[PDB]
Every structure is written in structure tokens, then in C-alpha cells.
Amino acid sequence: ESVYGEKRISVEEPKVEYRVWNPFRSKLAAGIMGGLDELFIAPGKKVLYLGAASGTSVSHVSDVVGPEGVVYAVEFSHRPGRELISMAKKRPNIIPIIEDARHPQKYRMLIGMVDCVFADVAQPDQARIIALNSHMFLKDQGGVVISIKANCIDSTVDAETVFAREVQKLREERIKPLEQLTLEPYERDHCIVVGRYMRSGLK
């Protein structure tokens, strides 16, 4: 069975069903299909998603953390959230939150010590809505994968100024960006930003 209609392959060994990676549906999948150096998603560790509406992306994150790792989805909306509920009724890694992540301490007992966080939201306070997660839940030297939508955060200003402004907003919060990407032909005027939450040795 497909989760949203993508085509899955199957192999045999003395059956593995691999779900293909649509890059247009997910800016994380477009970030993999654009090419990355050092990806903070891991085959064993625990990872937190922000902005997991349904399993357009977060099911693939549950795959890439596998039978070991666990994915803490963060969302708010009722109708894609219910899809995430009973789509998490088959995979054990997935657990979603229905709380607004402007106060991530409202669900602070529900996760302890996440290591990696991903950002997919459209809110204009994207640095603050990640910084209220990574100041309390993120492991030291655990990285942040931002997904910046420049027309939704601040659309009056120029193109690169949004990313160059948010990167300094991250550098105010001990979030040194390792590397940047734009992923243009998959999605027009977007970005993903790989950094590591440093907190010790920022210069």
C-alpha cells in the first residue's frame, strides 16, 4: 500500500518494499534530491519534525530512522493531524503532537532529549519557533535542518535577504549554519539550511 500514491518497489532475499522519494512533495526530499553533505537524520537516533501536516514527508523520516529511531512530529491542524494519527497506527517510530509549538514546554514531558530537528512551517517567526524547541529539547551538538519559504515569511523584501537574515537570527541563538541550499527546480524560491546547535565554541 502507498501512503499518498507514490510507487513503491520490492526485492527478494534468501520482501523489502522501498517507498520512492518524491522530491516535489517534500522540501526535505527535495533537499536530499538536491544533494547534501552531512545529514542530521540518522538510522538510530531520535528526531523531531516541526510542521508535519501529514505523511507527505514525515513517513519518509520514519523510514530513514527505521526500526531503531523515532520521529516526534509537531503539528496543530485537526484534519491532516488525524491522517497523521492513523498513519502512525502502522509505524512505531511516529508520534505526533497537536500542540502549538510557540510554547513547546506545553508538551515538555512528552519528549525527553531529542537529537535532531527539522523545520517545515510557514510561520514568520521561524527562528523563534525553532529556538523554543532547540533550547530545551535538542542535544548539544545536535543539528537543525531548516526549510525556509521566503514568500511566506517576509515577501516584500528581496530573495537572498530572507535567508541571510534568518541565518543571522540563528547565529544569535548558537545555531551556526553549516551549509545552505535553495532547491530551485523542485520548488521555486525556497531554501533548506543545515546547521548544528553549537552552544559551546560558536566562534
Partner 1 sequence: PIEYLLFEEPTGYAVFKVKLQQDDIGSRLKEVQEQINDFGAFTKLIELVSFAP
CB of 199 to partner 1, least distance (A): 6
Residue 16 binds to partner 1 (criterion: CB under 8 A): no
The residue among 115 and 120 lying less far from partner 1, judged by its C-beta, is 115
* Distance separating alpha carbons of residues 23 and 34, to the nearest angstrom: 9
Residues 45-64 that bind partner 1 (CB under 8 A): none
Residues 145-174 that bind partner 1 (CB under 8 A): 174
Applying CB under 8 A, which of residues 108, 124, 168, 172 lies at the interface with partner 1?
108
CB of 200 to partner 1, least distance (A): 4
* Distance separating alpha carbons of residues 192 and 203, to the nearest angstrom: 23
- The piece of 15-23, 107-115, 127-135, 186-194 that touches partner 1 (CB under 8 A) is 107-115
CB of 90 to partner 1, least distance (A): 22
Residue 201 binds to partner 1 (criterion: CB under 8 A): yes
Query: Whose grid coordinates read 508535519?
Result: 52
- The piece of 74-82, 85-93, 102-110, 154-162 that touches partner 1 (CB under 8 A) is 102-110
- DSSP-assigned beta bridge partners for residue 72: 48, 95
Residues 112-141 that bind partner 1 (CB under 8 A): 112, 140
- The piece of 59-67, 130-138, 144-152, 193-201 that touches partner 1 (CB under 8 A) is 193-201
Contact between 112 and 81 (Cβ < 8 Å) = no
Q: Which residues bind partner 1 (CB under 8 A)?
A: 108-110, 112, 140, 174, 199-201
